[PDB]
Amino acid sequence: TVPSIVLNDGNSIPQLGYGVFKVPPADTQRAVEEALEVGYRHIDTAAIYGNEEGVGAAIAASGIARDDLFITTKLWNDRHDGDEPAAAIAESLAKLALDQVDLYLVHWPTPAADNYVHAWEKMIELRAAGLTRSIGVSNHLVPHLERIVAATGVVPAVNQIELHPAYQQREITDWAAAHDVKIESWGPLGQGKYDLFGAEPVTAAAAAHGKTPAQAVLRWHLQKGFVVFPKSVRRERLEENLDVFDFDLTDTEIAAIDAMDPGDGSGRVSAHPDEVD
Ligand SMILES: NC(=O)C1=CN([C@@H]2O[C@H](COP(=O)(O)OP(=O)(O)OC[C@H]3O[C@@H](n4cnc5c(N)ncnc54)[C@H](OP(=O)(O)O)[C@@H]3O)[C@@H](O)[C@H]2O)C=CC1
């Protein structure tokens, strides 16, 4: 039924949602219509995904009240400077055809450009302007975090990062936990970049509960306190991935999955912030 988690700002976010990364813009409307139909209420898009349009149409097409929906969009890398943030969100808003998004994020820190503090400053402006209910960042390291916070005194609501069994970024989640910041896992199912489902601590928890391996992972994230939003273009999967409030892995089972993280950062499948310009 998807539980909702309380953010540091007093806003609630549905623990499981649907991501649109890699869904072609042209198929984006159907893709989202289905997800809404199936039962999903939290959509994760990005200006860079080029599909805010489909997302908006779908939402419009569906009969759901805005209140029951949670839209999240993101601020692209080339828009951190000056008042580009205000221009950026406004265009997203027009694409999505909404009055306001639920959450807005700084897509990447782009540390070489040294403009993330500035972008965060502006972010705080958009929230006060009512353009977005909450603000958070994505792909920010602990140093990035400490700085933006020390600089503004405004803690981000979330931090969306690459997170899965083989690469957990514990230093970040740990920090996030002490700072009342919620973690959003991206690429929660390894983005299909490695045999996650064949993983034995994975296969073991699956058969033990009669769930699929994909479902075992999600439940892992979920029990860890993470917000997840897997992507799939297949109805079956939307349904499968949505049915995970059933079981409950065991402490030991959770331990077994956790141990999949080598600790040398070798399980990473995507880009490291220090490489994204
Ligand atoms: N803020 C950021 O920097 C980023 C955020 N994200 C967000 O996180 C989302 C999720 O990560 P994403 O990169 O999409 O990777 P995911 O880890 O969620 O994996 C998606 C892939 O796994 C498949 N999939 C989904 N469910 C299942 C299942 N039960 N069994 C088998 N395959 C399955 C999909 O195939 P198929 O669709 O064909 O079924 C697709 O190939 C993105 O869509 C986006 O919203 C992603 C990247 C970066």
mmCIF file of N, CA, C and O in Angstrom, residues 111 114-117 142-153:
data_model
loop_
_atom_site.group_PDB
_atom_site.id
_atom_site.type_symbol
_atom_site.label_atom_id
_atom_site.label_comp_id
_atom_site.label_asym_id
_atom_site.label_seq_id
_atom_site.Cartn_x
_atom_site.Cartn_y
_atom_site.Cartn_z
ATOM 1 N N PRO A 111 31.448 19.539 -8.892
ATOM 2 C CA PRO A 111 32.448 20.148 -8.027
ATOM 3 C C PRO A 111 33.568 20.922 -8.710
ATOM 4 O O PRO A 111 34.123 21.847 -8.109
ATOM 5 N N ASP A 114 32.654 24.289 -9.264
ATOM 6 C CA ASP A 114 32.528 24.922 -7.965
ATOM 7 C C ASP A 114 31.289 25.796 -7.758
ATOM 8 O O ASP A 114 31.350 26.793 -7.032
ATOM 9 N N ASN A 115 30.135 25.426 -8.345
ATOM 10 C CA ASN A 115 28.920 26.240 -8.173
ATOM 11 C C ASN A 115 27.746 25.572 -7.408
ATOM 12 O O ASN A 115 26.596 25.998 -7.506
ATOM 13 N N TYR A 116 28.004 24.506 -6.655
ATOM 14 C CA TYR A 116 26.910 23.841 -5.963
ATOM 15 C C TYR A 116 26.316 24.582 -4.772
ATOM 16 O O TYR A 116 25.128 24.441 -4.469
ATOM 17 N N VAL A 117 27.127 25.390 -4.099
ATOM 18 C CA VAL A 117 26.632 26.178 -2.981
ATOM 19 C C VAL A 117 25.685 27.235 -3.510
ATOM 20 O O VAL A 117 24.631 27.511 -2.943
ATOM 21 N N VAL A 142 29.745 13.745 1.190
ATOM 22 C CA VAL A 142 29.614 14.337 2.521
ATOM 23 C C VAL A 142 30.186 15.730 2.663
ATOM 24 O O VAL A 142 29.657 16.545 3.433
ATOM 25 N N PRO A 143 31.296 15.983 1.948
ATOM 26 C CA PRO A 143 31.904 17.292 1.985
ATOM 27 C C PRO A 143 30.975 18.308 1.338
ATOM 28 O O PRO A 143 30.734 19.378 1.896
ATOM 29 N N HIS A 144 30.377 17.931 0.196
ATOM 30 C CA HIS A 144 29.417 18.799 -0.481
ATOM 31 C C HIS A 144 28.281 19.183 0.449
ATOM 32 O O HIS A 144 27.785 20.320 0.441
ATOM 33 N N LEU A 145 27.856 18.181 1.220
ATOM 34 C CA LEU A 145 26.752 18.297 2.150
ATOM 35 C C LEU A 145 26.991 19.270 3.287
ATOM 36 O O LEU A 145 26.199 20.178 3.558
ATOM 37 N N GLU A 146 28.103 19.058 3.952
ATOM 38 C CA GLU A 146 28.531 19.860 5.073
ATOM 39 C C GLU A 146 28.653 21.337 4.699
ATOM 40 O O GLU A 146 28.304 22.241 5.457
ATOM 41 N N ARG A 147 29.168 21.558 3.503
ATOM 42 C CA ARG A 147 29.404 22.891 2.976
ATOM 43 C C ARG A 147 28.108 23.640 2.688
ATOM 44 O O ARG A 147 27.882 24.733 3.201
ATOM 45 N N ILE A 148 27.246 23.044 1.865
ATOM 46 C CA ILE A 148 25.992 23.696 1.542
ATOM 47 C C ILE A 148 25.202 24.001 2.789
ATOM 48 O O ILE A 148 24.476 24.986 2.857
ATOM 49 N N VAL A 149 25.346 23.156 3.781
ATOM 50 C CA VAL A 149 24.620 23.340 5.016
ATOM 51 C C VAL A 149 25.220 24.410 5.903
ATOM 52 O O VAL A 149 24.515 25.214 6.526
ATOM 53 N N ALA A 150 26.537 24.379 5.994
ATOM 54 C CA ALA A 150 27.212 25.362 6.795
ATOM 55 C C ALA A 150 27.016 26.719 6.142
ATOM 56 O O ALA A 150 26.884 27.732 6.817
ATOM 57 N N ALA A 151 26.966 26.725 4.817
ATOM 58 C CA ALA A 151 26.772 27.953 4.083
ATOM 59 C C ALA A 151 25.358 28.545 4.175
ATOM 60 O O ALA A 151 25.196 29.764 4.218
ATOM 61 N N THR A 152 24.323 27.697 4.140
ATOM 62 C CA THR A 152 22.951 28.203 4.163
ATOM 63 C C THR A 152 22.184 27.988 5.443
ATOM 64 O O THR A 152 21.252 28.741 5.726
ATOM 65 N N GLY A 153 22.528 26.921 6.172
ATOM 66 C CA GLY A 153 21.799 26.608 7.383
ATOM 67 C C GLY A 153 20.496 25.878 7.033
ATOM 68 O O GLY A 153 19.613 25.717 7.884
#
